[PDB]
Symmetry: C2
Subunit: 353 residues, 2 copies
């Protein structure tokens, strides 16, 4: 069969690190395995434009493998033209780039799978790291050092411990719950969550969490807020000027979920005015972020409070190993005709939710 | 009585944040309390040279209050001139700036107290934060954003999770143990420690830690090493070229203990060569760090691997409130004549050691 694999070109970086599997040069580490299994692998980063390599191969591709770190948009037109398509895989987690609704509506027997669970620890670590970085005022401190300065009071005047703070998560699913688990031994004042379903009782008690019924009440009492929820109509633009005005004055806010959950200029204005002491995360809208995106240059009144990174938390080398292995497992389940997929990996099974 | 309080000058920063207690401008929040009790407080940052404000007041100071973040060196010579000195306090934790040996060996009736326990959480958080920053390659990632770049592969190629790593602490006292406690839910492969005495079985088991008998075998199996031990003859210069050559290749190293536990140029050479993937922490030797100290500009082969900060981890605003309250409590114990000090705060009591 013909498999089309769309990843970014890592360039010189791929030669520097053989465990950077999720790039066109290293091919998820499965190129030989695919060849030994008797299949033809087309690998490309060229995914935009009518004559892109991706579109040249869509008409007879049996399988397409994608990644949220360089997403091939599986659009209505591409689905129409993909006359042999049986399987779409996300080598990772996140299917925003696939028109799942259209696949479902067509009736076509296309399965869509992702490697569920493979990103969650990585993002949860990034959240807790960003919380510590912001609360403890690390960015300007390191900046002093590499600028050949030394002025402890300039850092200490806005540096706190995470101990004793009220910490709230919007969403307590796989990532959010793992964030709460990592926070327990830091002795927060309290861990709180809002979600559309309760944590099971034993899971709630394990982290000492208290559920809050509505988002305004949650943020109003939180020193630190973290967004760990899916993007949908209830969360798109949720973090806007009106809601930000209900946060505690000087709160710290982290978002590793989706950039569009925030209104970008409203977050920036809240950091400049002191409604927030700090903002960080690795998700942006639009993404990749333009050079002028307001979250690049925004700072608090002391010139700090910014712990943004590019979107990379879920593409550490340990996550990439999980993605590559999980992709191989999905592909084996398909090639053998067993279809013994892990239930949690299935997005669509032969077109059906 | 006359009290001499030696802190750093915070300048405009003290006006920006009234909770910055540990500076000359804000006087630990205790100036009006001391005045209302009829005492004379001299507050100064001027602690060096024979003409200093400190030395002007040494001869009739009853009490001297100090901080490790701007330490007045209470040397033999100053002690000898301090004809009325009865009490030395550390508004914080750390007594290396006080000649305790001389006080004890002479038998001079001088008590020395610190606010034990008030620094521990702050430093332990900073250790775990620094581990995450290094392992996850945060610093170059943030740099990309603020320089208006975006190149994920350049960050991802040296970014890992902390999960599944073997983490070792040199020292398992108050800070080291609270580092291990905070690491448990990150699902490390294993937590290890080296120390001169064992942790009790129950404390070991609570964090899943395994003791390794010597430092070479500890570091050789560790992906991450953290220093949480005092500076003494066993640790001075410990992290040197020879020991570093026994680290696991590409290890990450954190030191929030004392700068002189490392040989600075050897650590820099190991980061530049790839023996270490990253180094960080907030402690330096000399301290404050000179502008040319090698830990400022050192980097790994990718231009990263540096998570250094100035010495501030134990002077967060939450720590400063504990230090100010703890100083007030020690002073109240002294002024009332109760001497009802917290047992754990005593370093010397009227020149003598006391059972721990």
């Amino acid at each position: 069969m013909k498999i089309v694999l769309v990843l970014y070109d890592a360039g010189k970086h791929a030669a520097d690190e053989e465990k950077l599997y999720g790039c066109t040069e290293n091919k998820l580490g499965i190129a030989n395995w695919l060849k030994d299994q008797g299949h033809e692998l087309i690998t490309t980063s060229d995914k935009e434009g009518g004559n892109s390599v991706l579109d040249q191969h869509i008409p007879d591709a049996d399988i397409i493998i994608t990644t949220p770190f360089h997403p091939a948009y599986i659009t209505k037109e591409r689905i129409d033209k993909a006359k042999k398509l049986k399987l779409v895989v996300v080598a990772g987690v996140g299917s925003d780039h696939i028109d799942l609704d259209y696949i479902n509506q067509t009736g076509k027997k296309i399965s869509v799978l992702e490697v569920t669970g493979s990103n969650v620890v990585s993002v949860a670590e990034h959240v807790l790291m960003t919380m510590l970085v912001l609360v403890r005022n690390f960015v300007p401190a390191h900046e002093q050092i590499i600028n050949h300065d030394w002025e402890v009071a300039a850092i200490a005047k806005d540096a706190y411990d995470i101990e004793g703070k009220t910490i709230a998560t919007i969403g307590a699913g796989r990532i959010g719950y793992r964030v709460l688990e990592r926070l327990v031994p830091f002795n927060p004042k309290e861990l709180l969550y809002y979600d559309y379903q309760a944590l099971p009782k034993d899971a709630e008690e394990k982290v000492g969490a208290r559920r809050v019924e509505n988002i305004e009440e949650l943020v109003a009492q939180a020193d630190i807020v973290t967004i760990n929820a899916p993007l949908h109509a209830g969360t798109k633009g949720l973090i806007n000027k009106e809601l930000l005005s209900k946060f505690k004055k000087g709160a710290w806010l982290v978002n590793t979920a989706r950039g569009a959950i925030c209104v970008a200029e409203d977050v920036a204005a809240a950091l400049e005015s002191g409604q927030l002491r700090g903002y960080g995360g690795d998700v942006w809208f639009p993404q990749p972020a333009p050079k002028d995106h307001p979250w690049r240059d925004m700072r608090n009144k002391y010139g700090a409070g910014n712990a943004m990174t590019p979107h990379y938390s879920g593409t550490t080398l340990d996550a990439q190993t999980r993605y590559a292995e999980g992709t191989k497992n999905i592909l084996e389940s398909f090639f053998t005709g067993k279809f013994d997929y892990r239930p949690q990996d299935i997005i669509l099974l032969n077109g059906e939710y």
